[PDB]
Design an enzyme around this catalytic site. Structure first.
Site, PDB file in Angstrom:
ATOM      1  N   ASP A 153       0.839  -1.234  -0.153  1.00 46.51           N
ATOM      2  CA  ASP A 153      -0.046  -0.070   0.012  1.00 46.51           C
ATOM      3  C   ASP A 153       0.890   1.296  -0.056  1.00 46.51           C
ATOM      4  O   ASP A 153       2.117   1.185   0.364  1.00 46.51           O
ATOM      5  CB  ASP A 153      -0.810  -0.067   1.284  1.00 46.51           C
ATOM      6  CG  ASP A 153      -0.057  -0.072   2.626  1.00 46.51           C
ATOM      7  OD1 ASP A 153       0.181  -1.035   2.861  1.00 46.51           O
ATOM      8  OD2 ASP A 153       0.397   1.215   2.864  1.00 46.51           O
TER       9      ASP A 153
ATOM     10  N   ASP B  99       1.563   4.360   1.879  1.00 44.98           N
ATOM     11  CA  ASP B  99       1.399   4.966   3.456  1.00 44.98           C
ATOM     12  C   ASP B  99       0.450   6.295   3.395  1.00 44.98           C
ATOM     13  O   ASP B  99       0.240   6.683   1.939  1.00 44.98           O
ATOM     14  CB  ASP B  99       2.524   5.144   3.930  1.00 44.98           C
ATOM     15  CG  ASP B  99       2.567   5.317   5.570  1.00 44.98           C
ATOM     16  OD1 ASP B  99       1.382   4.745   6.246  1.00 44.98           O
ATOM     17  OD2 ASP B  99       3.197   5.883   6.211  1.00 44.98           O
TER      18      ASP B  99
HETATM   19  C1  LIG Z   1      -0.987  -7.120   8.722  1.00 45.83           C
HETATM   20  S1  LIG Z   1      -0.753  -5.142   9.122  1.00 45.83           S
HETATM   21  C2  LIG Z   1       0.822  -4.930   9.749  1.00 45.83           C
HETATM   22  C3  LIG Z   1       1.933  -5.339   8.319  1.00 45.83           C
HETATM   23  O1  LIG Z   1       1.797  -4.436   7.394  1.00 45.83           O
HETATM   24  C4  LIG Z   1       3.229  -3.936   7.131  1.00 45.83           C
HETATM   25  N1  LIG Z   1       2.774  -2.518   6.315  1.00 45.83           N
HETATM   26  C5  LIG Z   1       2.147  -2.414   5.418  1.00 45.83           C
HETATM   27  N2  LIG Z   1       1.760  -1.265   5.021  1.00 45.83           N
HETATM   28  C6  LIG Z   1       2.392  -0.446   6.027  1.00 45.83           C
HETATM   29  C7  LIG Z   1       2.340   0.975   6.121  1.00 45.83           C
HETATM   30  N3  LIG Z   1       1.829   1.830   5.564  1.00 45.83           N
HETATM   31  N4  LIG Z   1       2.941   1.324   7.418  1.00 45.83           N
HETATM   32  C8  LIG Z   1       3.711   0.397   8.333  1.00 45.83           C
HETATM   33  N5  LIG Z   1       4.200   0.866   9.347  1.00 45.83           N
HETATM   34  N6  LIG Z   1       3.535  -0.900   7.940  1.00 45.83           N
HETATM   35  C9  LIG Z   1       2.932  -1.468   6.655  1.00 45.83           C
HETATM   36  C10 LIG Z   1       3.941  -3.945   8.285  1.00 45.83           C
HETATM   37  O2  LIG Z   1       5.209  -3.904   7.953  1.00 45.83           O
HETATM   38  C11 LIG Z   1       3.457  -5.139   8.691  1.00 45.83           C
HETATM   39  O3  LIG Z   1       4.248  -6.175   7.984  1.00 45.83           O
END
Ligand SMILES: CSC[C@H]1O[C@@H](n2cnc3c(N)nc(N)nc32)[C@H](O)[C@@H]1O
Ligand SMILES: CSC[C@H]1O[C@@H](n2cnc3c(N)nc(N)nc32)[C@H](O)[C@@H]1O
Ligand SMILES: CSC[C@H]1O[C@@H](n2cnc3c(N)nc(N)nc32)[C@H](O)[C@@H]1O
Ligand SMILES: [Cl-]
Lengths: 272, 272, 272
Positions: free
Chosen positions: C211, C213
């Protein structure tokens, strides 16, 4: 006056003091890094303390900053002048240069930064210490003028970024710190500077650059061995600077300076 | 609706509520900062909680953010509106101004930010709460329109940087925070805002600027006493804003807003 | 050679290995996240480890990075190649893209980052590991060339900002991280990368963007469910990349590369 000296990596030599007596102490915050070394420089009473212990055994995250500053305070220190090995984040700060730092940026995460933690009868309340001017300007000015008298390459200001460590920074971090306005990088300035201020002590730091951190192209890699070698080559500069500075501090007027620090410290505490 | 009110430094006055009854509660995360004060503003049920305790005894690092939010959730609060004293990082945010903050930057380090810590049966799984819009927009809009109705100097947005404290920032830090886009600075917004969101509560913050932080030249030094004095002078503004806002919240439609928060909260949890 | 594989969220499939045997191990730093899965890819010995445990039970703050890396080291791994789900901080890094990251920015706060913590006889002294080049360049180059051979959308460099979590970032934080030079965002790269380097292991990371952010306008909101769905759609890419890369690592010459890592690791330790 009584001068606490906290000696950093490669920059902690008991032979700087005459008439030495070791004194192990305890504090409400635990034991300091090592025995206090009581002695004199000319006629000035000093207390030397090795930041990393006798055998350089203690990682920066686990140095007992509270016990170190509290022990020096209890021993009667009016001033604390420290040495610290650091990396350079600026082309003009060359390896071997001294930086009389005047600001910091905190990147530490695991560290108590106050004596007033709600668990010690010796420090009751909540303390919000001002940090606009973290280092004692009068001491810094004597260091600067003394470095000039000695002909040393010295920088009259600088912003120290203190990282948690014990790892060195990534290149992305090194670059980012420059954009934030950091000039030198180390692992110990915070919370040492903060706790000194809470204790009402005039604190200054002699930062010794040992390498360019990894932002800079076409330099040797940053490494423990290279840091230690550069310190070995340049440690005499810090020793001379301390030896020449301390008798000038000892003959300067401090009552007003110390009274203002004492007031700032006491008025920063919220009591119940 | 039921409005939780977390009162900040100099901005926690039980006399805001009528028909007051104190209620000490416990939570799976420990005890809240103080007794809950149950009462009413006009016809709206409210619960007041002093962030720093009865006697302002608790440093920002050690405020039990989990217990505070959990206690308000368990008491049936649909909304939490808080007050917080802060420093200004912008010329246009004058001491005495209110800022209805809409973003934060976390500089805290020692703080649990989730109920879902693997150690509580009441909050099972791993929670990754979205924080793109940390504060309830509908509540913020009622605060903004009410401040205007009252003729108050108020800013309709602002980014709060929350530092670990309890020290104030260095000047190098204050400058750096401006470059990062921070507008006001405090020690409590994070993780309070995060945990409210996990609890499915509509959370908003009335930030009261008490001083310009030390980036700004030719201002008084930042100090506990100056913060408290400025709060004493301006606390009436926050009290009026809360008193006038809360009955408007009480007559607004919230079912959809609260359902979306509830869904966001529940769908942010990864179960085994 | 022996390849450790640490599988991230939605990117940990034991079916990648043939001839599988599970092996629960213990370490001086505690238990790893799950059983080690011993197996092979073509003729190359591999060890798979689920970062978040069997049932995805473990929050990023509480993953035992020390035990995971130590266990893989003790099992004889020369290389560790990992997968990690991340958010994109750059328009050109689209959801579904792979990023072969080459730098990090640490935003974690609660995490041990060294084996040399003063409490373990197996790791004595203070270790200051260099982090100028945190990821193994030779492994990264094989990943890059293999992604190209597979026709995959892949980025040959990138700076990962690792946040403490478990919350996602605020919009103010997301914007700030871009200004610092971060390209992708996650919760696990630090201290995993640091500890691998201390262990003398060649470490590389396959980061999968799921995605944009919340800095980016006009995109779906960041959420657990959207992350998991995007991973489900794209997980085959990481599996193919690993399957095709690993036999090429197995037929490459590593003695010199591994000797230099071993020397860097051992010479970074200050002994008493
Ligand atoms: C199942 S939800 C948690 C997982 O989502 C990953 N991840 C994906 N998109 C994002 C984002 N925009 N910001 C952050 N911090 N983490 C994100 C994150 O590394 C972790 O592996
Ligand atoms: C013996 S190796 C550890 C010592 O090295 C000092 N030091 C020197 N150069 C750097 C650098 N580039 N980055 C960082 N973080 N620290 C550095 C550091 O403050 C500590 O005193
Ligand atoms: C009684 S002294 C402590 C109180 O002062 C508030 N506060 C005001 N001005 C500032 C400032 N310039 N910087 C920081 N960090 N905090 C500030 C702070 O949020 C806390 O509520
Ligand atoms: Cl930071």
């Amino acid at each position: 006056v009584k001068i606490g000296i906290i000696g950093g990596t490669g920059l902690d030599d008991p032979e700087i003091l005459e008439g030495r007596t070791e004194k192990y102490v305890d504090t409400p915050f635990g034991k300091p890094s090592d025995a206090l070394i009581l002695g004199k420089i000319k006629n000035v009473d000093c207390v030397l303390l090795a930041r990393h212990g006798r055998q350089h055994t203690i990682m920066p995250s686990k140095v007992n900053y509270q016990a170190n500053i509290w022990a020096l305070k209890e021993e009667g220190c009016t001033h604390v002048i420290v040495t610290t090995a650091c990396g350079s984040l600026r082309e003009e700060i060359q390896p071997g240069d001294i930086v009389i730092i005047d600001q910091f940026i905190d990147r530490t995460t695991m560290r108590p930064q106050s004596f007033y933690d709600g668990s010690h009868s010796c420090a009751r309340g909540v303390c919000h210490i001002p940090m606009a001017e973290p280092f004692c300007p009068k001491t810094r000015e004597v260091l600067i003028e003394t470095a000039k008298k000695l002909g040393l390459r010295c920088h009259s200001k600088g912003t120290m970024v203190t990282i948690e460590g014990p790892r060195f920074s990534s290149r992305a971090e090194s670059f980012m710190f420059r954009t934030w306005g950091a000039d030198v990088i180390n692992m110990t300035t915070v919370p040492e500077v903060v706790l000194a201020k809470e204790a009402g002590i005039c604190y200054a730091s002699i930062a010794m650059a040992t390498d360019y951190d990894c932002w800079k192209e076409h330099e040797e890699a940053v490494s423990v061995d290279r840091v230690l070698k550069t310190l070995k080559e340049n440690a005499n500069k810090a020793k001379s600077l301390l030896l020449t500075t301390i008798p000038q501090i000892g003959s300067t007027e401090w009552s007003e300076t110390l009274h203002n620090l004492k007031n700032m410290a006491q008025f920063s505490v919220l009591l119940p």
